[PDB]
Design a protein around this ligand. Structure first.
Ligand SMILES: *[C@@H]1O[C@H](CO)[C@@H](O[C@@H]2O[C@H](CO)[C@@H](O[C@@H]3O[C@H](CO[C@H]4O[C@H](CO)[C@@H](O)[C@H](O)[C@@H]4O)[C@@H](O)[C@H](O[C@H]4O[C@H](CO)[C@@H](O)[C@H](O)[C@@H]4O)[C@@H]3O)[C@H](O)[C@H]2NC(C)=O)[C@H](O)[C@H]1NC(C)=O
Ligand SMILES: *[C@@H]1O[C@H](CO)[C@@H](O[C@@H]2O[C@H](CO)[C@@H](O[C@@H]3O[C@H](CO[C@H]4O[C@H](CO)[C@@H](O)[C@H](O)[C@@H]4O)[C@@H](O)[C@H](O[C@H]4O[C@H](CO)[C@@H](O)[C@H](O)[C@@H]4O)[C@@H]3O)[C@H](O)[C@H]2NC(C)=O)[C@H](O)[C@H]1NC(C)=O
Ligand SMILES: *[C@@H]1O[C@H](CO)[C@@H](O[C@@H]2O[C@H](CO)[C@@H](O[C@@H]3O[C@H](CO)[C@@H](O)[C@H](O[C@H]4O[C@H](CO)[C@@H](O)[C@H](O)[C@@H]4O)[C@@H]3O)[C@H](O)[C@H]2NC(C)=O)[C@H](O)[C@H]1NC(C)=O
Ligand SMILES: *[C@@H]1O[C@H](CO)[C@@H](O[C@@H]2O[C@H](CO)[C@@H](O[C@@H]3O[C@H](CO)[C@@H](O)[C@H](O[C@H]4O[C@H](CO)[C@@H](O)[C@H](O)[C@@H]4O)[C@@H]3O)[C@H](O)[C@H]2NC(C)=O)[C@H](O)[C@H]1NC(C)=O
Ligand SMILES: O=C(O)CC[C@H](NC(=O)N[C@@H](CCCC(=O)Nc1ccc(F)cc1)C(=O)O)C(=O)O
Ligand SMILES: O=C(O)CC[C@H](NC(=O)N[C@@H](CCCC(=O)Nc1ccc(F)cc1)C(=O)O)C(=O)O
Ligand SMILES: *[C@@H]1O[C@H](CO)[C@@H](O[C@@H]2O[C@H](CO)[C@@H](O)[C@H](O)[C@H]2NC(C)=O)[C@H](O)[C@H]1NC(C)=O
Ligand SMILES: *[C@@H]1O[C@H](CO)[C@@H](O[C@@H]2O[C@H](CO)[C@@H](O)[C@H](O)[C@H]2NC(C)=O)[C@H](O)[C@H]1NC(C)=O
Ligand SMILES: *[C@@H]1O[C@H](CO)[C@@H](O[C@@H]2O[C@H](CO)[C@@H](O)[C@H](O)[C@H]2NC(C)=O)[C@H](O)[C@H]1NC(C)=O
Ligand SMILES: *[C@@H]1O[C@H](CO)[C@@H](O[C@@H]2O[C@H](CO)[C@@H](O)[C@H](O)[C@H]2NC(C)=O)[C@H](O)[C@H]1NC(C)=O
Ligand SMILES: *[C@@H]1O[C@H](CO)[C@@H](O)[C@H](O)[C@H]1NC(C)=O
Ligand SMILES: *[C@@H]1O[C@H](CO)[C@@H](O)[C@H](O)[C@H]1NC(C)=O
Ligand SMILES: *[C@@H]1O[C@H](CO)[C@@H](O)[C@H](O)[C@H]1NC(C)=O
Ligand SMILES: *[C@@H]1O[C@H](CO)[C@@H](O)[C@H](O)[C@H]1NC(C)=O
Ligand SMILES: *[C@@H]1O[C@H](CO)[C@@H](O)[C@H](O)[C@H]1NC(C)=O
Ligand SMILES: *[C@@H]1O[C@H](CO)[C@@H](O)[C@H](O)[C@H]1NC(C)=O
Ligand SMILES: [Ca+2]
Ligand SMILES: [Ca+2]
Ligand SMILES: [Cl-]
Ligand SMILES: [Cl-]
Ligand SMILES: [Cl-]
Ligand SMILES: [Cl-]
Ligand SMILES: [Zn+2]
Ligand SMILES: [Zn+2]
Ligand SMILES: [Zn+2]
Ligand SMILES: [Zn+2]
Lengths: 696, 696
């Protein structure tokens, strides 16, 4: 038969291995010829594999690149203005790639140009609370200083925004061995750790979901009217540059001024981690000078869009999307994901050649320019927003398939919790010691739920990947899954070789997944979810799981507010409306669930009515007015944290109104806005419940 | 059989007459006990008539009322400060109603309080072009003056906004016999003309679609957080008051300063129509003093919502809505409409008692607080916006059924043109001289299309009624129909007794429609449209009619721009993208039409796919970012004119960018914004076309 088991059995580890090798021999930087050539290869092959149509969708968006003939670097300069120390111009290339052309040197994408000179201040991870410590407790003023910050904890764009608002005139980012060097394992090429010359690339924008900085709201097509650079969304106003720990040691070792305030400010280098400002006595007349000459350029990008038309509901879309563009070779990020997508397409295509079709339409996407701000997915969605919002069932992301080899990681909407539990119970664990056991058993054992005994951890969606426009802007049910590490040792960072030249095919084949078994398990999870979403007669969403988390989030936000009991009395701040809405959602969802299991389906109009009620339930959490000063974050339950784009925040409107409230000048106005956000949230929860009531 | 003919034949003129009489014996002002009692009567009767459920939906919104013990009035005062002339405190009540309690005296709803004193300037109709003439050509400065303006041409709220922006410190509105006294007909009670003591009530807000001034975006429910008065939407900043032509004569007769600039500034009173400022020589030390003491008050309002559940598609809504609140007796506005709705409900209910049900759900609405800013419809829609946007097929409005007795008037979306043509061909004309002929024949003869020989005039929707939230905010296909006058004699105004105490049952029965035949014809048009929309297997919308008007609108906006050929060359202003999008819409709509007529319907999924494509086509013209500084006007093809809320404007974004462009300080910036609006329009038209392409 043509069922889920036929789909799943056709997936092969050895195919995934061949595709990864094929996608990782040369760099595929967005906007380059190399990456256009790969786009055309993927298009031709998805056609060979059996899809009904495969098209390129192109856009002209703002990208950023270093100047080839005028390199970026940082100096220590003496009182005469002699440059006595210079940071490196390139990462030493890995064995056998030392002749590869067009490796982009490390840089911070979208940095403005400049040569600022000044005294250094060390700001730990440049988090909101690091700046609070420095400015409020230690009384150190960053205004007109160059700040040096270690990578980790939070998205680098948030670090830059925080430094800018503190008055810094430049930012230097570095990788500390405390965060990117796991104890007892060797540096690349002999193990999976970051060497002292390794550097993490990455953009430093604050887009808040806008997409292309020049065309917020509308696709960057051939006739688009653009903003001028001065009005572009999300660009930083001070120069930024990333370095490795060999270079960082030479900038940190002379630091004077105040001592670090406690041991959470000390990394693992042989230096005091003094905060500054400036260098100790003998070197106190030396300065740090940045030299940044990168340029922003409007450049063409290419998405590949494949269609497998549905047999019964061709106007209902289940999307499997992930990016293709890489910083250099992309051995983990993104090609470990893209190779998985390619094998999934191949398997659906083999079923299609034997006469099978899914019930609903499946769209497959190879996105461009993800590394420069989620640009290709967001422009495409801006173009197709009306089709997506009335027809979009679900979005499954497909970036890196591995970031470790310990256990599964899932982040998703509560609407897919029961789908994920059911599927993982039918899959085999790849783990050593669990042969013959289910993936559910191994995952639950290694990553237990903090709430419920005998269940696994499933996280909220944050951002920093291509699901953002689908989930937080448009309200399409979304999820993602990969293999991950045990979060001991380097607990505040991704894998050590992230966005470095050392992320290669050999990294993966030698040190992460030599049998390609973790890749195969991830293909079965991502693929299996898509199969169910596109083929189950009733959509596989359980509204009751949203009711349970809504109560948890309401308890959490109430507890935050209750740190201020005297203000809640004075300004009559009540959460009663929100708890009432959550109770109502719980009751209405339960009755909906009963009708769903019973009506059953001799009647296709009743079925589609309840499938439409299921599809539009995520959609009901969208406020067309957006969140304050963030118009493209429209989901009222979930937004990316204002302090860290990678992390999700629940009831973000209320959370941000409460944050640091004890420091606001006008408390009556601040508490007024807390109350306004309570009203908005309660109304939206009740309105979402009401979509599940009987329709007439 | 239970078909359209059974529905239509059950409607009776004599029932409509009895209901009008019943609804017009006492005043039904929003927020009063009288109007709550009528709401409860309508609820009980719609239940008796056979609807499945009938509920009240209440809101607490900002309303405005005069102070009972401190009356509003205007004076001429002398140099000593003696009040030598005072305007009247009330309209003389009509015969037999001189003992009715609670007739609200004439006032301008939402006026601030004040007693400003000053010199008068006469500003004709207070249109944008009247102020341009006064300030640019005649060099007269309205700053710190009281302005007096005649009613007509444009919505009164626009007059107030224009006066305020010119620096006026108060506004006096009056009814000129030139606009409200038809030659050769007598004053009420002996004919249908406005007497010298008659006054037009009405609100003076500039809401731009917001609804309740205190809760933009969200329903004004029990836990809503409100804006303070200072941040309320749309309130005027200077006092305003309306008067009749007896009083107006006494304010205008002493005017000096400059002469009227031409005869289009002269009405029909025996006065020079001098512009001022101030009075002639001997009276030049006299002034005009306003006394306004009205208060804004948060007050409860009640909508009645009736449901007739659909047999096949209960999750698809066809809405018939009109208001119940009146200024005084409401003999035309709104009860001539509400009596029509009541008989329509009764007729659908009789079919339902014999076992029939419509295919789709029909919702019936009796809206409150329409006269204070479309408040009841807009709050209800804000509450139910998620259900309306995914399930709303169409909205048919039902305010005043008559404004004359000459011929039919229809304003609607192009999607209902072919529906209206087909229906009116099957209805009998009520007109003298057309007995035995169709309503299509009489209407086409009396109101020919300016474009097409052998077809009737159908106008764009403007605003100033309860369809605004459904059409311009939410993108639900909308229409309205009534009997109207021949637009000779008083061509710039509604009927003479509009919003006066003299609009009574007797006005209608004696002078407009003694046989109730025009009412019956309007019930058949409104009712017939609802019947078809709720019962036709394929929705009765023709996408090809949108293609035809889109070309007309594109030609029109191009022609406006081409008044500035040198600027179009210098700034490279091209309409090519918009014409391309319109061509594409024409081609795609034509192919869609062919698939629609053929697929035919053994296949209900294919049917619903194309019914969904039809329903979501109006919805595709919505931009979730809104129009500039008007976030609740989201439709890109149609908005209410920025200069006149009653009139519709096509491609409003482009139109407003071009308006008065030759006066802007920075032409490169102004023409940049023209180009931005061209891009937005072209994109939206192409995106709307693409919803009609094959779905996969
Ligand atoms: C969770 O779900 C429940 C439904 O089970 C909702 O309950 C409603 O709650 C509101 C309060 O937010 C109640 O509002 C009150 O309505 C009264 C009138 O209700 C009757 O009549 C209406 C017609 O207008 C019917 O629809 C309804 O069924 C009732 O028969 C008003 O009289 C109340 O106002 C008076 O008291 C208040 C409170 O002190 C004063 O402020 C006022 O000034 C006034 O004196 C009030 O407006 C409503 O009746 C409830 N519906 C029910 C029980 O069916 C919850 O609201 C919902 N949670 C959320 C967040 O939506
Ligand atoms: C009305 O409907 C028609 C479709 O019938 C649309 O036509 C498209 O118009 C755009 C222009 O807006 C064309 O865009 C051009 O695409 C070229 C590549 O197209 C080929 O390859 C793509 C894959 O990316 C395929 O999808 C496509 O079928 C083609 O095979 C580009 O090379 C062009 O860019 C080059 O020339 C331009 C113009 O001088 C330069 O500015 C560039 O720098 C570059 O050198 C260009 O982008 C598109 O191909 C047309 N599609 C067709 C014919 O199918 C209209 O756009 C539509 N109207 C609106 C308003 O949407
Ligand atoms: C994840 O897996 C779980 C466990 O299998 C699954 O929950 C189960 O779903 C089934 C199917 O809905 C439930 O079965 C129903 O049981 C009730 C009462 O006991 C009956 O009323 C139902 O009978 C109707 O429907 C049947 C077909 O589905 C008809 O054969 C019958 O004639 C009736 O019309 C039905 O048998 C079962 O109770 C739950 N089990 C639970 C909750 O423990 C869950 O749905 C899966 N999640 C997904 C797919 O997202
Ligand atoms: C307003 O009234 C007009 C005039 O009646 C109406 O337009 C007409 O609609 C009918 C029904 O779609 C059209 O009839 C079709 O003609 C074409 C080609 O000549 C045929 O392909 C069609 O045959 C198919 O569908 C039939 C059932 O509808 C089946 O019996 C048949 O087996 C085929 O499947 C069909 O007969 C007619 O051509 C137009 N006339 C015009 C445009 O002049 C219009 O639709 C009405 N507007 C509304 C309802 O909004
Ligand atoms: O522009 C954007 O929104 C994101 C573009 C890009 N996106 C990613 O690289 N996303 C990776 C991030 C992987 C690295 C990681 O997870 N970092 C991390 C882990 C724990 C922390 F506490 C802090 C950082 C992913 O989603 O797989 C980037 O972050 O520069
Ligand atoms: O607040 C609002 O948006 C409108 C509230 C109310 N609405 C109406 O009274 N609407 C009537 C207006 C009827 C009078 C009219 O049509 N006036 C008109 C006609 C021609 C002109 F050139 C100018 C005005 C209707 O739609 O039937 C009002 O206008 O005060
Ligand atoms: C990755 O695999 C593809 C597909 O086999 C290779 O592209 C093909 O190259 C052959 C030999 O030159 C050509 O004849 C085909 O026309 C290509 N097919 C395409 C583009 O669809 C590609 O060379 C491989 N890349 C690497 C780095 O090994
Ligand atoms: C750091 O790099 C700079 C720039 O290349 C070096 O300074 C230059 O040295 C050359 C040759 O002595 C001079 O002609 C240039 O005028 C210098 N340029 C600037 C901007 O100072 C410097 O030697 C390097 N420092 C170290 C320690 O290698
Ligand atoms: C308008 O008609 C209604 C309905 O007949 C009248 O309301 C009824 O009044 C009678 C006699 O007092 C009561 O017994 C009924 O209970 C009422 N029914 C309702 C409210 O549904 C109403 O009196 C009439 N109004 C006027 C002004 O004639
Ligand atoms: C216009 O109305 C005003 C207010 O009622 C009249 O002026 C008042 O007259 C009484 C009795 O003479 C005085 O005691 C008050 O002090 C006056 N009030 C004000 C505010 O001036 C006035 O007589 C009326 N004018 C005409 C022509 O009837
Ligand atoms: C890159 O730098 C060189 C000079 O070192 C300069 O000639 C060129 O303009 C720069 N390229 C840009 C800005 O693209
Ligand atoms: C920080 O330093 C700048 C520049 O000298 C100054 O203008 C600013 O007010 C300072 N802030 C303090 C001391 O809080
Ligand atoms: C792969 O798994 C083994 C077994 O625990 C572990 O020791 C090794 O470090 C893992 N590789 C990576 C990259 O985590
Ligand atoms: C109405 O006017 C009287 C005085 O003439 C005053 O006592 C009362 O406060 C006013 N009512 C209001 C503001 O509602
Ligand atoms: C109109 O008069 C006011 C007040 O006297 C003045 O401030 C304003 O500038 C004047 N505008 C002109 C003369 O254009
Ligand atoms: C009703 O119709 C007649 C016939 O033309 C007309 O003369 C009369 O004035 C009409 N009534 C109104 C209110 O227009
Ligand atoms: Ca864009
Ligand atoms: Ca509101
Ligand atoms: Cl992912
Ligand atoms: Cl990281
Ligand atoms: Cl109307
Ligand atoms: Cl009028
Ligand atoms: Zn990635
Ligand atoms: Zn990345
Ligand atoms: Zn009305
Ligand atoms: Zn009215």
């Amino acid at each position: 038969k043509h069922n889920m088991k036929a789909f799943l059995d056709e997936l092969k580890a050895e195919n995934i291995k061949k595709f990864l090798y094929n996608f990782t021999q040369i760099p595929h930087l967005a906007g380059t010829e190399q990456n256009f050539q790969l786009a055309k290869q993927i298009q031709s092959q998805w056609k060979e594999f059996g899809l009904d149509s495969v098209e390129l969708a192109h856009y002209d968006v703002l990208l950023s690149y270093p100047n080839k003939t005028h390199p970026n670097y940082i100096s220590i300069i003496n009182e005469d203005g002699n440059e006595i120390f210079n940071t490196s111009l390139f990462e030493p290339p890995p064995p056998g790639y030392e002749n590869v052309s067009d490796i982009v040197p490390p840089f911070s994408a979208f940095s403005p140009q400049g040569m600022p000179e000044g005294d250094l201040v060390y700001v730990n991870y440049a988090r909101t609370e690091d700046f609070f410590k420095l400015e409020r407790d230690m009384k150190i003023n960053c205004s007109g200083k160059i700040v040096i910050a270690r990578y980790g904890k939070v998205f680098r764009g948030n670090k830059v925004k925080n430094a800018q608002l503190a008055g810094a005139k430049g930012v230097i980012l570095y990788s500390d061995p405390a965060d990117y060097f796991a104890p007892g394992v060797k540096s690349y090429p002999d193990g999976w750790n970051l060497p002292g010359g390794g550097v993490q690339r990455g953009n430093i924008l604050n887009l808040n979901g806008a997409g292309d900085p020049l065309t917020p709201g509308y696709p960057a097509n051939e006739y688009a009217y653009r903003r001028g650079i001065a009005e572009a969304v999300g660009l930083p106003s001070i120069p930024v540059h990333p370095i490795g720990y060999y270079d960082a040691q030479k900038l940190l070792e002379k630091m004077g001024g105040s001592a670090p305030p406690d041991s959470s400010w000390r990394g693992s280098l042989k230096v005091p981690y003094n905060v500054g400002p400036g260098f100790t006595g003998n070197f106190s007349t030396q300065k740090v000078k940045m030299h940044i000459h990168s340029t922003n350029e409007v450049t063409r990008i290419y998405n590949v869009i494949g269609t497998l038309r549905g047999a019964v509901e061709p106007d209902r879309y289940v999307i499997l999307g992930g990016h293709r563009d890489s910083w250099v070779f992309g051995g983990i990020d993104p090609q470990s994901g893209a190779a998985v997508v390619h094998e999934i397409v191949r398997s659906f295509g083999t079923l299609k050649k034997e006469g099978w079709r899914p019930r609903r339409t499946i769209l497959f996407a190879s996105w461009d320019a993800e590394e420069f701000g989620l640009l290709g997915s967001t422009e495409w969605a801006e173009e197709n927003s009306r089709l997506l919002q009335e027809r979009g069932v679900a979005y499954i992301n497909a970036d890196s398939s591995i970031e470790g080899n310990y256990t599964l990681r899932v982040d998703c909407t509560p609407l897919m919790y029961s789908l994920v539990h059911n599927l993982t119970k039918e899959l085999k664990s790849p783990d050593e010691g669990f042969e013959g056991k289910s993936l559910y058993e191994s995952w639950t054992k290694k990553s237990p739920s903090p709430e419920f005994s005998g269940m696994p951890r499933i996280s909220k969606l944050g951002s920093g990947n291509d699901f953002e426009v689908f989930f937080q802007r448009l309200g399409i049910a979304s999820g993602r899954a990969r293999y991950t590490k045990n979060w001991e040792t380097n607990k505040f960072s991704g894998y050590p070789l992230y966005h470095s030249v050392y992320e290669t095919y050999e990294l993966v084949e030698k040190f992460y997944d030599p049998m390609f078994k973790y890749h195969l398990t991830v293909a079965q999870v991502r693929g299996g979810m898509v199969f169910e979403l596109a083929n189950s007669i009733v959509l596989p969403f359980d509204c009751r799981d949203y009711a349970v988390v809504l109560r948890k989030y309401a308890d959490k936000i109430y507890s935050i507010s209750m740190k201020h009991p005297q203000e809640m009395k004075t300004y009559s701040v009540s959460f009663d409306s929100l708890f009432s809405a959550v109770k109502n959602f719980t009751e209405i969802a339960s009755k909906f669930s009963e009708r769903l299991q019973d009506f059953d389906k001799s009647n296709p109009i009743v079925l589609r009515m309840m499938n439409d009620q299921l599809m539009f339930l995520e959609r009901a959490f969208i406020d067309p007015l957006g969140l304050p000063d963030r118009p493209f974050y429209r989901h009222v339950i979930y937004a990316p944290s204002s302090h860290n784009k990678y992390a999700g925040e629940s009831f973000p409107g209320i959370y941000d109104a409460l944050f640091d409230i004890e420091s606001k000048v006008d408390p009556s106005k601040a508490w007024g806005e807390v109350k306004r956000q309570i009203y908005v949230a309660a109304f939206t929860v009740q309105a979402a419940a009401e979509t599940l009531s009987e329709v007439a």
